[PDB]
């Protein structure tokens, strides 16, 4: 497999919130938030197992981040190398007037390079 092969597109969602790109929360709806991240993947080695790790980052005004939550899952790429994975973070207390972003990394269980 070409080391450069592979794409992850991610869409974050919050339970019982309909907003997207970005998700918007009222200050009252910040306690025990259930964040899902939908990972659309393409050009992964079909039928191979990946360690999918998502990271909920607090993004400060100066562009630096601090990780507040993380979730990892053994997943399998569809045989076509395209498909979808879902990831949900443990319940999180978020802060009013703050901005959060989700990172995603997929590493194959096997050495495919």
């Amino acid at each position: 497999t070409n080391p450069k092969e592979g794409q992850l597109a991610t869409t974050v969602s919050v339970k019982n919130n309909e907003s997207t790109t970005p998700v918007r929360l009222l200050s009252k709806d910040t306690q025990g938030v259930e964040v899902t991240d939908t990972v659309s993947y393409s050009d992964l080695v079909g039928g191979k197992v990946y360690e999918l790790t998502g990271t909920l980052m607090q993004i400060k005004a100066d562009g630096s981040t601090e990780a507040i939550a993380s979730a990892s899952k053994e997943v399998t790429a569809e045989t076509s190398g395209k498909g979808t994975w879902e990831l949900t973070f443990a319940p999180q207390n978020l802060k009013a007037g703050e901005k959060y972003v989700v990172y995603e990394v997929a590493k194959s269980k096997e050495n495919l390079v």
Binding site: E5, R24, L25, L26, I59, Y103, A106, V113
Partner: peptide
């Protein structure tokens, strides 16, 4: 091969990946 296949999406400005809290 000697290493793992690593695909990352780590874009701090991706709106799709962003939650904004009001107040």
């Amino acid at each position: 091969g000697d290493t793992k296949h690593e695909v990352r999406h780590e874009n701090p400005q991706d709106e799709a990946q962003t939650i904004v809290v009001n107040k």
